[PDB]
Structure 1
Amino acid sequence: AVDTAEQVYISSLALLKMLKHGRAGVPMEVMGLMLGEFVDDYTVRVIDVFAMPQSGTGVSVEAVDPVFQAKMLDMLKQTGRPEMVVGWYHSHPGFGCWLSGVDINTQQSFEALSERAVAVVVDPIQSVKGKVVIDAFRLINANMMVLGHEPRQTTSNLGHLNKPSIQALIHGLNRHYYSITINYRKNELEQKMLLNLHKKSWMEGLTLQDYSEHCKHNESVVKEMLELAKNYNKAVEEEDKMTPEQLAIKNVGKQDPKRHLEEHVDVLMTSNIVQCLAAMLDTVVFK
């Protein structure tokens, strides 16, 4: 009878494998297996994550082929992957990320070997592309109903765990069903390689190709955006001619939610491209 403060380490490997697995996450029930290494009691690290072939039965203990699982794990052991399995993941599209009776039964059957049994459910179908915040699931002991539910120390991270604060699943099904916090980790190779790779993904090949395209399109295509921009500017000034009457009568309170200022500032920002690229044309013409 002892419990500690565990935290699931999530790198970019399992994240991207859950993003591609989420793209291939058909409404049919899918299967997955997570790997890693156990260094101590209250920490867990995942490194290897792969997918499993779909079946008509779906998420079940019968669909897990022991000769296929042990075969692929042996093929990973003969290679440079000396990590044991740490859990299994899946997707719950539509009906919510909660776990049914079959999922908790195969979880109870699959947790006999690993005491942790990390469970992660990705659902990018109804999740907006703004946030990709994911949550990890855990299994509580049925004999702990008499004592405290979760005697876990370090209650500070619960504020970070309160971000998924849906009012139906967390305390709608919190009985015998809790969760755990999730953190990330990034070394210098992922920071410089992935940062420079993303900056290059938003940059050009030689970085000097598409500059003259806009520098010379300022005289052909942008002129239409400047004339239309002046058409919207006049379309606002026609009301700005009527503004000094009300502003000259009431001067108390604001009724129009439009600011009429930041939009013109943005128009000036779009207009400053000519000024910023004029020096570019000066450098291309000069040398």
Structure 2
Amino acid sequence: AVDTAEQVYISSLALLKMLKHGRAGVPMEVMGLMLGEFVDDYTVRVIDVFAMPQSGTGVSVEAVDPVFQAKMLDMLKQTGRPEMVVGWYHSHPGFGCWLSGVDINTQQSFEALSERAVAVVVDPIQSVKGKVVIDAFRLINANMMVLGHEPRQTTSNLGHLNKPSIQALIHGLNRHYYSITINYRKNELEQKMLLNLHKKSWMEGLTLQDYSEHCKHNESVVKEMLELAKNYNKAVEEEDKMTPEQLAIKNVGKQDPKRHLEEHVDVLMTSNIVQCLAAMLDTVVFK
């Protein structure tokens, strides 16, 4: 029987492709095929993925196009990947990470051809920079769940994924389908380019800010600092005077002179120190 230790290893390219398809087709439950290989009985690499046409309305899965799938597979084999289809992925823009009736039917269709086929659900809307909402699934058998069986084998203690969400539990988790743990492959080579993202050229590194604009910015910021200094004097005065509401209900809806003054000093000091250092380094290097 299947084990409660199966792990779907989604590659960086696969994850990026699912997220791009997600925040390209919204709210349509856009869909694609996950290409990889069942290396063993407990692991499923998903090396790549590729989208499907998404013809017309796509609020529901669209009965994977066999001709498009075949031509994708043949050309990928021609230009690289000789890998079979290990599953299908689709998007749930803000719903969560559950499966609908159509999703369950499509995953039955996938299992019929390959018993190990996985169903990945991404949530491009709920994903944030550092945690991508995504979940792998396979369906529980009505036959076994009526004939008193757990359709997962608990050899390991790897069934602590996230205390599955109430959304999934009410949408049919642990009854008609189960969640498969997901990990990722780190190569330290793609990560170099992902780090090269946000990188600035040495032009920007050494450029000096327009001096007139810098002076105007300093003048303005010091003006707001002056006003916030007046307000800070006012606030510190009537702060110890009374603290029944000072704890939480004396700053809501009203400006905080101390906080804004801290922000202004931080920003202006950063700007001035950076520009001074840039000017000095420039005066020497470009001599």
Normalising by structure 2, report the TM-score.
0.70
Provide closer, same or farther for how the CA distance between residues 26 and 213 of structure 1 changes in structure 2, counting only shifts above 3 A: same
- How far off is 1:98 after superposition? 2.9
Residues 161 and 181, structure 2, Cα contact 8 Å, conserved in 1: yes
Which string of whole-angstrom CA distances, capped at 9 and with x for unpartnered residues, describes residues 259-282 of structure 1? 999989979987995898699689
CA distance in 2, matches of 1:155, 1:254: 58
- How far off is 1:179 after superposition? 0.5
- Range moving further from structure 2, 72-81 or 213-222: 213-222
Provide closer, same or farther for how the CA distance between residues 204 and 10 of structure 1 changes in structure 2, counting only shifts above 3 A: farther
CA distance in 2, matches of 1:65, 1:153: 34
CA distance in 2, matches of 1:172, 1:150: 15
Residues 97 and 135, structure 2, Cα contact 8 Å, conserved in 1: no
Residues 120 and 137, structure 1, Cα contact 8 Å, conserved in 2: yes
- Range moving further from structure 2, 20-29 or 143-152: 143-152
CA distance in 2, matches of 1:65, 1:248: 59
Q: What SS class does the counterpart of residue 181 from structure 1 fall into?
A: strand
CA distance in 2, matches of 1:239, 1:224: 22
Which string of whole-angstrom CA distances, capped at 9 and with x for unpartnered residues, describes residues 197-230 of structure 1? 3454999465777999869954665664566466
Provide closer, same or farther for how the CA distance between residues 235 and 92 of structure 1 changes in structure 2, counting only shifts above 3 A: same
- Tell me the residue number matched to 2:77: 77
Q: CA RMSD in A?
A: 5.9
Residues 52 and 68, structure 2, Cα contact 8 Å, conserved in 1: no
Q: What SS class does the counterpart of residue 204 from structure 1 fall into?
A: helix
- How far off is 1:17 after superposition? 1.2
Provide closer, same or farther for how the CA distance between residues 216 and 147 of structure 1 changes in structure 2, counting only shifts above 3 A: farther
Identity of aligned residues (%): 100
Unaligned runs of 5+ in 2: none
- Tell me the residue number matched to 1:167: 167
Q: How many residues align?
A: 287
- Range moving further from structure 2, 87-96 or 44-53: 87-96
Which string of whole-angstrom CA distances, capped at 9 and with x for unpartnered residues, describes residues 10-54 of structure 1? 222122112211211222342211111232221111122121222
Which string of whole-angstrom CA distances, capped at 9 and with x for unpartnered residues, describes residues 67-100 of structure 1? 2210121111110222221111112346554323
- Range moving further from structure 2, 124-133 or 200-209: 200-209
Which string of whole-angstrom CA distances, capped at 9 and with x for unpartnered residues, describes residues 165-206 of structure 1? 326636864312210111122112123332243454999465
Provide closer, same or farther for how the CA distance between residues 283 and 182 of structure 1 changes in structure 2, counting only shifts above 3 A: farther
Residues 215 and 280, structure 1, Cα contact 8 Å, conserved in 2: no
Which string of whole-angstrom CA distances, capped at 9 and with x for unpartnered residues, describes residues 102-139 of structure 1? 22122111212222211111223356667423221112
Provide closer, same or farther for how the CA distance between residues 246 and 229 of structure 1 changes in structure 2, counting only shifts above 3 A: closer
Residues 35 and 46, structure 1, Cα contact 8 Å, conserved in 2: yes
- Tell me the residue number matched to 1:259: 259
- Tell me the residue number matched to 1:205: 205
Unaligned runs of 5+ in 1: none
Provide closer, same or farther for how the CA distance between residues 17 and 248 of structure 1 changes in structure 2, counting only shifts above 3 A: closer
